[PDB]
Design a protein around this nucleic acid. Structure first.
Lengths: 23, 146, 100, 54, 124
RNA sequence: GGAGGGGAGUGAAAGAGUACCUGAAACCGUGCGCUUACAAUCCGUCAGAGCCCUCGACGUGUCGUGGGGUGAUGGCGUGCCU
RNA sequence: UCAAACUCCGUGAUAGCUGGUUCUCCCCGAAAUGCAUUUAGGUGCAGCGUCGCAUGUUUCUUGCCGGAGGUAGAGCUACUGG
RNA sequence: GGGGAUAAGCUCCGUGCGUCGAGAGGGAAACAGCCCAGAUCGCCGGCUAAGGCCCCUAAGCGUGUGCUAAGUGGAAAAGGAU
RNA sequence: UUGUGCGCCGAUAAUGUAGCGGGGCUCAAGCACACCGCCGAAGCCGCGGCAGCCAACGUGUUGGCUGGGUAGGGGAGCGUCCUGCAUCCGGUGAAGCCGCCGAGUGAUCGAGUGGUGGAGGGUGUGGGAGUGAGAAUGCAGGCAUGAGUAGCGAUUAGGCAAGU
């Protein structure tokens, strides 16, 4: 829950440009 | 090659700052700059060569927002349920020096050199200090245009 | 009293007698060589403009050609089987500033 | 139980240096005109002629 | 025909264990443990050879900037000014000046002050 | 007490003594120099203070196109193989 | 030690299985897809690699001309169904 | 795009699309596949990308005009509200 | 009443703040739009050394392009032993071992010198290999950590004087 969401929301940073691996 | 300060090289100075309604962050950044030594051209990170700092009227520090009473300093003994917290107002009315200290200590390296720097930080809740026989230089926090 | 020489795609602060190591120039041990300049200082004032700086040039004497320190390389990556050994000494040419 | 690692040189020699010995605190005795050194525990028994002095 | 292997191994053992006099423990006595650390060591040396450039340059910049700010100019505008003025001195040597002779550095500061644009935040 | 050893000897050599050609490493210790008891360390590497040894040009001690041992402190850094 | 002892021999049994396989540099450099398979964790051929010879730009890229498509979309008194 | 609940760091196909595999270095707080960029060796040389310039962390408590009062920034729905 | 830009509540889990990376920040160090500079990588450039493919020329010079790399293919080499052949050193001290000073792009090298030690070795060209070990819950011998720790083998029980 928390852990997956924080992963999938850290991806919306600026140095990643909206995407990360394994979400 | 490049210059590296030897032993008989350092020249010290005792600066003194007013905390008369200065902003805590400005004050603390300035003190960190001075202590670490980013204002002299002899700077080297392996050496401590900054300047002693004396803070006064530290009970006059005034912050923004609701940080006086919505902000919570924390600690932890290490025991279970030994997390205990305090506001900033309670902590001023208990002992004001600690607020400004910890604020600055978080603006320094937390290494051996940082511990050896904190020695060079003196803070006093009132306007006074016993360190007049060094004739402390008043520092006025300024911003350089460009 | 001093000056700042350009060479080797690099810069070096100098004055007469100050021995220096640089890249491999093309001359014999004992010969002389001139060089361009970026800055010059006569006491307190400065020469900082390109026309004066081209009009000034520093002269140096080649003491000896030389070899720098031995440099070991063992490139390596894990779970792979990739080692790669290699070595290096860089050729040098010691200069001695005669005058300016 | 059983250890898990090969406990180092530093730690090993360090603790090993606690297994030491102290010397008894010695004291003179005038054993029949001449002198010998003996603990204080046995002083009277030496002066009375029981301690085997070699 | 039978070839004992002693010499042909002793050679590299001697090499490595000569090159690990200063290491601390089984990294200083034993071939199978010092070999590994030699891998890591030479590698870290390589990496540091590539990066001490940035280290020193960082240092030089901190010195320059503090010197300038005590003469009341920022680093960025100093370098804008010297670029404009075509001055050639590099940062190693600006730092050396800052240490030894602050007067000359103040003169260069003044040159840049003179040669900067008037309205630095202009749209040009 | 004896084992064992120190002198005196033999011998070209006893760093050939019947545990004996040479006599490595692990390993076990004794001395000499540096360092280490407010500190979080895949144990190293890059910069480097300080001290000690050394070669050389000089001068009553002194920097150097030096070199070597230790190395406070800072940055970087997630063992080897399958 | 017994759902068929022990020893020698056949015998260095055999394993689509696990592990292991030692000095250096130089150049180029993948694949994890297809059909079959008592077959799916293996293998054969094709695929992608390199080496040598042969054929010399035939490959690739961009522009312009020529060609079939029934995808998105939209449409339905233009068919089948709601 | 299918299966699934139009869920899965799920599973199965496409793609002169990519990277990892076999690919280091910088940024992402740490982080094989994300963004930048494809490492012949050296230099105590310079300019840049992505990203970022209060201190820790090198670089701007930068300029100008407006919004924010929520520590929003620095997780979130249906819906509610001068 | 419409559409907008930031905002409020809804909001809510278990070792310890803990959904800015931290201090701290609205006297923005936060969001937006324009502007100015700068830092920043093993990228590009700059000075140098090596190398592969091609090309031009002259009796091997230069230049352009190139040089991450696992499975893997190809090419060129060091080292060890025994030997055919020719020569060199060796009880006026070889090897082997411990070294110091130095070298090579690397495997490695010292016909460069010291200590120990006591009889075989080196060189160039060819030949042939039991030809290079860090891992196989690998074999043989030796030695460590655990450790100067656990134990010292019953439920009968030893003692004092004298003795050599």
């Amino acid at each position: 829950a928390k852990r997956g969401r924080k992963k999938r929301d850290r991806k919306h940073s600026k140095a990643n440009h909206g995407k990360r691996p394994n979400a | 090659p490049t210059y590296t300060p030897k032993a008989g090289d350092t020249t010290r100075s005792w600066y003194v700052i007013d905390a008369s309604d200065v902003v805590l962050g400005r004050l603390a950044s300035a003190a960190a700059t001075l202590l670490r030594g980013k204002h002299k051209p002899t700077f080297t990170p392996n050496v401590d060569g900054g300047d002693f700092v004396i803070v006064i009227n530290a009970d006059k520090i005034a912050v923004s927002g609701d940080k006086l009473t919505k902000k919570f300093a924390y600690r932890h003994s290490g025991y279970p349920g030994g997390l205990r917290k305090r506001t900033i107002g309670e902590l001023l009315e208990k002992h004001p020096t600690r607020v400004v200290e910890n604020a600055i200590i978080g603006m320094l390296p937390h290494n051996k050199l940082g511990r050896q720097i904190q020695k060079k930080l003196k803070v006093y809740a009132g306007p006074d200090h016993p360190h007049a026989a060094q004739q402390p230089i008043p520092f006025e926090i300024k911003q350089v245009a460009q | 009293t001093y000056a700042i020489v350009k060479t080797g795609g690099k810069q070096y602060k100098v004055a007469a007698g100050d021995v220096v190591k640089v890249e491999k120039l093309d001359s014999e041990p004992g010969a002389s060589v001139s060089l361009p300049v970026a800055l010059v200082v006569d006491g307190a004032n400065v020469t900082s403009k390109a026309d004066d700086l081209a009009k000034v040039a520093v002269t140096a004497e080649v003491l000896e050609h030389t070899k720098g320190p031995k440099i070991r390389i063992h490139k390596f990556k894990n779970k792979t089987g990739y080692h790669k050994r290699q070595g290096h000494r860089q050729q040098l040419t010691v200069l001695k500033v005669t005058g300016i | 139980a059983v250890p898990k690692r090969r406990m180092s040189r530093a730690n090993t020699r360090s603790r090993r240096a606690q297994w030491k010995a102290e010397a008894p605190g010695l004291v003179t005795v005038s054993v029949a005109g001449q002198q010998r050194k003996v603990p204080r525990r046995l002083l009277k028994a030496a002066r009375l002629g029981l301690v085997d002095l070699d | 025909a039978r070839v004992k292997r002693a010499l042909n191994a002793q050679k590299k053992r001697r090499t490595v264990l000569k090159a690990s006099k200063g290491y601390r423990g089984q990294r200083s006595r034993l071939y199978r443990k010092a070999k590994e650390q030699q891998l890591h060591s030479l590698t870290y040396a390589y990496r540091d050879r590539r990066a001490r450039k940035g280290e020193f340059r960082k240092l030089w910049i901190s010195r320059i900037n503090a010197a300038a700010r005590a003469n009341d100019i920022t680093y960025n505008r100093l370098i804008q000014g010297l670029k404009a003025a075509g001055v050639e001195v590099d940062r190693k040597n600006l730092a050396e000046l800052a240490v030894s002779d602050p007067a000359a550095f103040t003169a260069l500061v003044d040159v840049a002050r003179a040669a900067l644009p008037e309205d630095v935040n202009a749209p040009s």
